[PDB]
Amino acid sequence: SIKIRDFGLGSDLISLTNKAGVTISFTNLGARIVDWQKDGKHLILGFDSAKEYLEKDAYPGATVGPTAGRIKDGLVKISGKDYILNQNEGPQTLHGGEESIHTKLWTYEVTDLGAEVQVKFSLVSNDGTNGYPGKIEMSVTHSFDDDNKWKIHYEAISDKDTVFNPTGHVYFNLNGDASESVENHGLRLAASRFVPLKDQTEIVRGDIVDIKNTDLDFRQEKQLSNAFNSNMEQVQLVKGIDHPFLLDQLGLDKEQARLTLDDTSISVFTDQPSIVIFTANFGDLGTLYHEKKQVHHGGITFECQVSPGSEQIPELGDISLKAGEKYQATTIYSLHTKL
């Protein structure tokens, strides 16, 4: 079934329930996922109204872009030219700059295919917006099916050469409660390398590091507490994880990661080369989710995209988008329950 309701400030909440009784819900405010629940338990973090996102934290569940992550000094080179983007975290451009696409109301259309239902959000980023050349016509399609698969499909076309590398910022918490650390979750991740951070500013350090046989090697399922209790300077630097992991094998058919808690597991698939993992290292911040005070490590992301820092480490890839080329990206979060 599909249900639409006012979510506040003019935004809508679109809720989809599949044959299995699973419920996923989205909002046009930032083309974002608000909730995902089974047998009355939330699997992800989210608020109860649009206002909360705007007042508390606008990132959770959102489509962030045009470029996800931190860009050093807000500087990108486009066709040999330097461009300075909006700086909203010191001199860095973080998540597209201030008042970015995650804070705008996107238009949308719902398509019911029976076994699958799609919600297509659209937004136009005007040329020059936050320093980005455009116009960029963007669309993010969130779909949910009877097999419990939640798919995100991105598309974009720009009038001018520009940069483009968005991501979905959902935070998972299989505890179904923010006051509970995800340290008890087990994680498996098909990556043998990562990108270390320079320092507290979180810009990249400059190198690519082999993680095999370290507290961060999750090639084999392991409990998060491990990483969390690690003494690796990188863990100690951010007080958890807040890094880009490089996938060993690319392609949508490969399960790239898996988050497990008891009977319940989330599998991640993507056509992207990297997954940025952030473990809600907010300390005592205590953001309120459903009346529950969030704890340090009370969430974890799987931001699939081209690794941040390609400006300094070209091996990471290239986020350029040439005029007229069609950008496409796909990320899938599949839900399973052991019998």
Place this chain on the structure above:
Amino acid sequence: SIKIRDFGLGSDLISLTNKAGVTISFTNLGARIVDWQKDGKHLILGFDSAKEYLEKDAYPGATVGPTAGRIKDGLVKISGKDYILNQNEGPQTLHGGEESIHTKLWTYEVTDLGAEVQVKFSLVSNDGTNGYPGKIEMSVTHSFDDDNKWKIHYEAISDKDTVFNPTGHVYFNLNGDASESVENHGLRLAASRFVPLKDQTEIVRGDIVDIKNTDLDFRQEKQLSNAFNSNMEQVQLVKGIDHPFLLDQLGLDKEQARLTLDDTSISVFTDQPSIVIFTANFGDLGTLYHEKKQVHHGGITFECQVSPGSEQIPELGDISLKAGEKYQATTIYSLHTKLEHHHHHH
């Protein structure tokens, strides 16, 4: 009463009814007026869904900006600096550029004050959007009261020195039918001068001309047909009216314009210096409004703003907005019945 429902594409329709029974409705798509009815008759032009605006004509009833009108070659000078804005009409920047504010979903909140209901729409124009320095935090409040006054109040604050001069693009048609020309309406307008356009590109000619005693003189009420039938160069150039009229006396207290048909009148008040009047000179385009094919001259706007062309004619005003400085503008459209005797035939 206040009612709300989805209007299409994720936009909403907000419908108000005052104690007199008059109904007016707005959409967050472009902080825009959708309809205004008296006794079941439309007083303005509008569509029945969001998609129509997007597919037919996205300007009607909309909030347009950040700068309303045409800017020659998209060139503005901001604090000694030259800036080129998005050019969407040939080399011209028309109504803020392509995919401007009238095309966005604004957030909003409704305030019920009893005799008055306010709908405040908000949007942020990011720094650099369409070439405009910012960021600009904007807000448009549309309100309707028991006295049948529909008021528009604009507010804005920029992080950087920029330009700002928005307007409301409603189209009136007291016939309540797009297929009926407004040549039968009576118009009274407190303006002695106008701004001629250079040519078909519609940029300003460069001079200000006195229109007293010509077919464009509406100081004393006259039928619109007088203008439409005129062979004055300016009328012929645009095939009707599409010009800024400079108000003779400024201030929100004064009735600047009055449009009448039979027993119905719409009065215009504003704190702005000019009113740009466009009479839907679309020829045979025939855009469908409620299944009625619109006729040439099937509508008239009263876009109150600082006149377009100030870039070339400094005398017109200055639309610059300094960083941190609060912009405010107020325009009011009031509805009246039997304000005067208007009994004509066409």
